[PDB]
Ligand binder design. Structure first.
Ligand SMILES: Nc1ncnc2c1ncn2[C@@H]1O[C@H](COP(=O)(O)OP(=O)(O)O)[C@@H](O)[C@H]1O
Ligand SMILES: Nc1ncnc2c1ncn2[C@@H]1O[C@H](COP(=O)(O)OP(=O)(O)O)[C@@H](O)[C@H]1O
Ligand SMILES: Nc1ncnc2c1ncn2[C@@H]1O[C@H](COP(=O)(O)OP(=O)(O)O)[C@@H](O)[C@H]1O
Lengths: 301, 130, 281, 301, 281, 281, 301
């Protein structure tokens, strides 16, 4: 989460409505209000047995929304991001890494030292049910407390049918954290089978998902985002270059207009000026292409 | 009306023949609801000698009704596969009764020479008396 | 579900008179239409003492043990010795390996100890949920296991019409071989009607300590009819906390409108995602 | 074979032409005559190095014709049915399941003690040629008599090229039983290959098959079949509901109409009557759909 | 099969002169057209003492032993010393690994006994039916084994046109690699005519002790033409049994009519079930 | 190259300022366009002390080693300690270096040296030449290994447009997962211009000790522009040997015309053989 | 390789232009001159890191040119022909077969007797690197002398990405032989990928390939080829018989036409004629068909 260090929280009023600019979040009012409602649902344990899905385009603040939810849950609540491609591995079974990340998000505090549940298995190991039983005895005795973290899983369609089914049964456990899937595809066959399904998820897991929409940004909001990332990286910018950066973010993605800020500062330093100018953004945009445009130029030429 | 429909296949023809087997009336009118041109497409070697004798005798039932269609139907029966072995497969009883039907029905004085010549030309190669 | 429950009752009478033999039951229909409720209802209606086992789906092909071992353990789970099941006897005598001595010993015991309350046996209702995922290997094992004496009453569930058999190329109804399908009493579950949706939402309101007026109830019944029952059930909790944020005593129609605006359903989000992906990519 | 109890042989005259109603068989005169002729071929040891194929629609006598062939050979002669799916048991090799059924079909009597060739392997459990030569020596010595049974294999297209090759090699054995394949498929790809072939069988095995065609039934013959099945089940019926049962069999299948009889008796008992009324049949066929109508319902919505 | 037998005789005269070198033979024609008869006659005409080995393309996948092990056993079976084959020497000195010491023992012993003018090594013939079923590894092993000086004459046989080489994507003639096909003398076997069918059915009727009039014989010849010869061979036995049930002393056209009506050929049964499947969907 | 080298300089200043954490570099131009040259240029411009770990995507899948073993060996080889790499440290303390406990020991011991300041650490440059050939498991391993603070600077190279990742049916740019593409800084290398081709051919001539007049040099430049630079580099050697065979000294235009007539470029031979393969079909 | 027995060299003038008929070669002037220039490139060390690719239709003398090159380099410089299908072996890896032929192609003479490096690799059984170090030490002492040979790899498209990448790696070794790919496929998908490429070879290896074009033959050149091939096998043959053989060669392929000569001689020996006649070829071409004609005949049936 090196790229969302500015996300302090959802930025909600006492009444639950989001503020237009607060806690690092600028825009995206519907999804922020929905995330606030879901946070209130986690706080009183009404989401036990369900999970969250963020359905929206790329560079739409889904990972920022999950980080805001995890920050809003508590002070040092853990946040485990991962990708579906990470589940496949040559050295460990896919199910094993799935439970590894799943249990890594279950934080506990013992009266005061804080540690994640997967560290207990890593030290004591496979034998996870016994670890669950002893931490249940600990928290029932009151000497320790549990905090459910946030297991964020981007590219949910990449997960296999075995992965989806195992997550469906594994959500039944009382100690489990909130699992936040994220997707941008829609129609996609479930990996490992030929049946189409919404968002590449089977029906048996889609039964228990609470969906939230995230909407694309207008240019002004995107320019505000690039400005916020400019201040957080200790860079200096102006409207003449920020407008071009916003156009570049619109035409490719906000994840490629926020990656270009640092080399713009570097090429500005090579040009002998400490402040980024429009020529710097033109130069770095000419040099470094996005993945889609780069592949397009590769296959066309 | 709905009981007597066009068969699409030899399966359909044989299953219509089985149901209508005991009653000749729904067999003599069965051949009217089907085109003889489609007959070599309907039968794709699924035609046994008893069925051949039955169909020829059924065409004899309404020979005089539509004589051209009869001499078309028998002619179209020549276009089925495995016809030569089929007429070679006839037993002596069917051979004799086909000769009787030839002298009675298909070579009577009522028919004109135009259909009679074609019927006798086909019957030279059906019976194969020698 | 009235027709499906009546069919379950007729099958239960077939079980009680023993006329069912070398036969299984299938519960078809759209997903989430209370199929497991029918299965457990039949199992309890035979008797609470009789065992039950819901094992199957994609749960098989993911456990540490092989598919045949899991199927054997679940099959032995659904044979109650009175209560203790045969699988419990296997765990006491211990996955590891399954010993064949137990069948000989319990055959001798039921031959000797019966009508004493020691080693009588009742057959349970096995339930193989989401059977279309099972391989042709699993169906062959099912055929070999059903023909054995003192077998459980097999029940299977499916929510797909015609699929490829898992492990072969040839298609079949319900993803089951024809030799199985020529023995299955297929119960079909109809979709829920308006009076069923309203009653289910009222039961969930009573369970979760949520009060809401009749306008909200009728609009939520309409939403559940149009969209989904589980979506409406999620809306109950979400609107309850939305009204709690306003310090209200009773959930109102504005809470349902707000939460329906916020939390999308599967179909609406599917529409809003394809409307991005088809044009912008 | 809980069903097929009413069948007690082909029921033929001494001249060999079948009787229209005898030994449980209704109609099906051509296939019954051919089955009697094959029985006479088996009696004079002429079927060695050959197998039988029953090609026809489902519910047209085939499995019942094989049982009639097995019954006509003798009361002691066994009948081993199986399906193509049954070979794919994971715990035991497919060729082993094939040869196990192959040896289960082979009957012997030692003089009297009736044993299959599978039991002699189980008591002396592979090592196949030792028991084969031993039983050859026994029957040469006259201490034992060989009665080959009927290995019936329905759904033959499901078998693969390894299975078909093993069957083709195993048919060469002198002590083999009569392999009655049964099929309801036309051109089909042999499993494990791509090329279509007749009945999903390779040409090499088709060069030794005697093929018999089984015809589908009229309404009258189907009504007689359901009447026989109802009488054998100790169910009391009338012609009025039997016409409806014949209609249901003609619309879906004969097997479905036969299997509806027991729940019809149960529904009649629920309504306080022993006789199966027409309304009972309407209730049961409304409840229990066949596989095809159920799949048509599931395909919709 | 006059032209094919003539070509086989030409290859025999080639082999006697040692001109075959590294080449082999392929028999390419429709199934059951005297392939194995041609190969066995070839091996006999080389000499009655000459060894012979036979194998089907699918037999190597029996799973008792690997593909290359079965091919090695088949190759060793088709070599002799005179008598004993090298497979028999392997069995005497034994499956295990075919150690190279047996080849050195064969070389030294046969050299010593050839010096004495008492015995010599003889290459035999290896026949492979259904060569299109062979895998690409099996073809590579075939080239490797034929490279050896002790290798026998290879006679592959196929009943398939252009098709994919099995285990790869390349389409080649007969499902064989090209590099083998440039060194194969392809003998083609023509289909049987009316007179050949009549002679074969006459010989089979003589062998079966069945006597038939000329009308039934000609009708059966027509059946053999239009429905292949093997179906007529089956109809001979069926019609003999029908005549025996009729208590006759000769099988006539009535019996052939009855048996043709009863026992279908592959074409009519395939047509009947294709027509059903067309109706059914 | 001009723009690509300037981009490499900007990235060089970025790594030198310690701003590369959580990123990698992608060189996504056409093949044979100085990808590896830019890689060694980056490694040299950081410093001669910094190690450079070359690897290509097809090499890891050799059967002597696993994909993850080759990847972790190349990963550890790119990290220098002072001069010695971590793979050399494993060789000293002990792919072949399959040893996990002493990997933990090495990590702990170099960690205490790093904290104590007795022996510093320098991250190098890990170049993966054919990253599109890496499987999804390989990409997952790379994503995991980059998270370590002890990781090297990752450079990947490819010449594929949009394509499907190996081991998956999903299409993406360059056969890389999106989660890695979102971090990669994508350099693109332009094709060589006429002046660049002329210059490169001049240095290749002087290195080869080959003399040409200006007309031959400009014809060879035209040949390189039309077809390929590497084909022209082959023609330098071929024309030099052709002139040496004829007892001349300076390579003339006629020798180049002869060599172009004899040796075909890839596209010309491909077209000539496509004509035959289309004709023979 | 008895078919190429008549070839003894490229048959070039001192000036390097080919002779029309010399050293067993006839015609093929362009490819012969190109191979002569490649031989002169090989006499110097300029061939290092490169390979040759003979692209042309079958029967145009690609293997002939490779054997001519291997004869031209030295007195008995070794020639190790193979095909791509030879690489796929069940007993040993594809890479092992590749290295086996690759090292069989290398020759070493020691003071004097010659031996292949495969003998050292197998008898003195890390093995490749250790023996390479030993041979490098041996040749650097000025006591062993290297004669590199020719690894002719026919049917290059049959190989896959692993084999091509491994050959690209192994060509850079100092002691490598002159790998001569040969192909007759225009554009083909490399096995293991879905990328079309020229000649079935990948782009990474195609850079280091010198390509030679071989031409289809005039009728008179095919006549001369058949004449010399018949003469070397000690056959006498008529002119019109050669015309018929050349017609058959143009019809199907030159390989079939040359292979028909031995059965033509055997058919002529039958009926007591030492000289082969036209009717012998009319008989033989009817008896033995080529592969394409036989596949067409089987597909018709
Ligand atoms: N509403 C927002 N407020 C602040 N930053 C945002 C917002 N939406 C997106 N971003 C920024 O977008 C960048 C890329 O992350 P994100 O857009 O969340 O990726 P994705 O949507 O693919 O998960 C981050 O710097 C993130 O903080
Ligand atoms: N000739 C017959 N007489 C009586 N019942 C029959 C007859 N043929 C078939 N049946 C009934 O039809 C049912 C289904 O057909 P079956 O014999 O199993 O053939 P198939 O294998 O084609 O399904 C059987 O259970 C049997 O009761
Ligand atoms: N230029 C030539 N001169 C003389 N004989 C040739 C020539 N080219 C080919 N041949 C003969 O024709 C045959 C054709 O095979 P060849 O062309 O070598 O196969 P490939 O093209 O696969 O290498 C060879 O066996 C050789 O004897």
């Amino acid at each position: 989460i090196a790229t969302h260090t500015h996300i302090k929280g959802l930025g909600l009023e006492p009444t639950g409505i989001p503020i237009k600019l607060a806690a690092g979040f600028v825009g995206q009012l519907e999804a922020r209000e929905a995330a606030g409602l879901v946070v209130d649902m986690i706080k009183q344990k009404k989401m036990a047995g369900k999970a969250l899905l963020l359905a929206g385009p790329p560079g739409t603040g889904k990972t920022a929304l999950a980080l805001g939810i995890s920050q809003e849950l508590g002070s040092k609540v853990p946040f485990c991001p991962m990708v579906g491609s990470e589940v496949y591995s040559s050295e460990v079974k896919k199910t094993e890494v799935l439970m590894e990340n799943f249990r890594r998000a279950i934080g506990l505090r013992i009266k005061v030292q804080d540690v994640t549940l997967q560290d207990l298995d890593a030290a004591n190991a496979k034998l996870r049910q016994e670890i669950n039983k002893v931490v249940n005895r600990y928290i029932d005795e009151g000497v320790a407390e549990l905090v459910p973290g946030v297991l964020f899983i981007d590219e949910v369609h990449m997960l296999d049918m075995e992965c989806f089914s195992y997550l469906n049964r594994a959500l039944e456990s009382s100690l489990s954290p909130i699992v936040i899937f994220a997707t941008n595809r829609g129609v996609c066959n479930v990996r490992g089978t030929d049946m189409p399904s919404p968002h590449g998820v089977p029906i048996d897991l889609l039964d228990r998902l609470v969906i939230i929409r995230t909407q694309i940004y207008d240019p002004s909001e995107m320019i505000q985002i690039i400005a916020i990332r400019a201040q957080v990286e200790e860079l200096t910018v102006d409207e003449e270059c920020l407008v071009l950066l916003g156009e570049i973010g619109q035409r490719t993605s906000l994840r490629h207009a926020v990656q270009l800020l640092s080399p713009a500062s570097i090429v500005a330093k090579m040009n002998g000026r400490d402040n980024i100018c429009k020529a710097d953004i033109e130069e770095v945009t000419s040099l470094y292409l996005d993945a889609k445009s780069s592949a397009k130029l590769l296959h066309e030429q | 009306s709905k009981n007597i429909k066009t068969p699409k296949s030899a399966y359909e023809f044989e299953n219509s023949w089985r149901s209508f087997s005991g009653d000749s009336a729904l067999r003599s009118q069965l051949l009217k609801v089907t085109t003889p041109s489609s007959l070599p497409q309907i039968f794709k070697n699924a035609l046994t000698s008893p069925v051949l004798v039955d169909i020829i005798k059924c065409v004899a039932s309404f020979f005089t009704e539509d004589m051209d269609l009869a001499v078309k139907y028998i002619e179209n029966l020549t276009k089925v596969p495995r016809f030569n072995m089929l007429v070679m497969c006839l037993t002596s009883t069917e051979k004799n009764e086909l000769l009787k039907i030839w002298e009675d029905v298909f070579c009577n004085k009522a028919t004109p020479m135009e259909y009679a010549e074609v019927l006798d030309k086909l019957r030279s190669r059906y019976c194969l008396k020698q | 579900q009235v027709k499906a429950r009546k069919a379950a009752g007729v099958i239960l009478q077939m079980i009680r008179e023993g006329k069912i033999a070398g036969r299984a039951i299938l519960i078809a229909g759209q997903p989430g239409t209370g199929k497991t409720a029918i299965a457990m209802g039949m199992a309890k209606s035979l008797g609470l003492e009789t065992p039950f086992a819901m094992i199957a789906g994609s749960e098989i092909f993911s456990l540490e043990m092989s598919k045949t071992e899991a199927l054997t353990q679940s099959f032995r789970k659904a044979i109650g010795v009175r209560c203790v099941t045969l699988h419990e006897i296997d765990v006491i005598n211990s996955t590891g390996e399954i010993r064949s001595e137990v069948r000989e010993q319990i055959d001798t015991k039921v031959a000797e100890w019966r009508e004493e309350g020691k080693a009588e046996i009742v057959p349970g209702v096995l339930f193989i949920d989401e059977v279309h995922m099972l391989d042709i290997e699993c169906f062959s094992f099912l055929n070999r296991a059903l023909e054995n004496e003192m077998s459980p009453i097999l029940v299977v569930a499916t929510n797909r019409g015609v699929t490829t058999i898992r492990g072969t190329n040839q298609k079949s109804p319900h993803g089951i071989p024809i030799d199985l399908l020529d023995r299955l009493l297929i119960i079909t579950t109809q979709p829920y009607t308006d009076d069923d949706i309203r009653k289910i939402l009222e039961i969930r309101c009573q369970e979760e300590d949520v009060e809401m007026n009749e306008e909200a109830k009728q609009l939520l019944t309409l939403i559940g009819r149009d969209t989904s029952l589980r979506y409406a059930i999620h809306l109950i909790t979400a609107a309850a906390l939305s009204c709690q944020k306003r310090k209200g005593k009773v959930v109102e129609v504005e809470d349902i409108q707000r939460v329906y605006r916020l939390f999308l359903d599967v179909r609406r989000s599917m529409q809003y995602l394809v409307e991005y992906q088809s044009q912008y990519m």
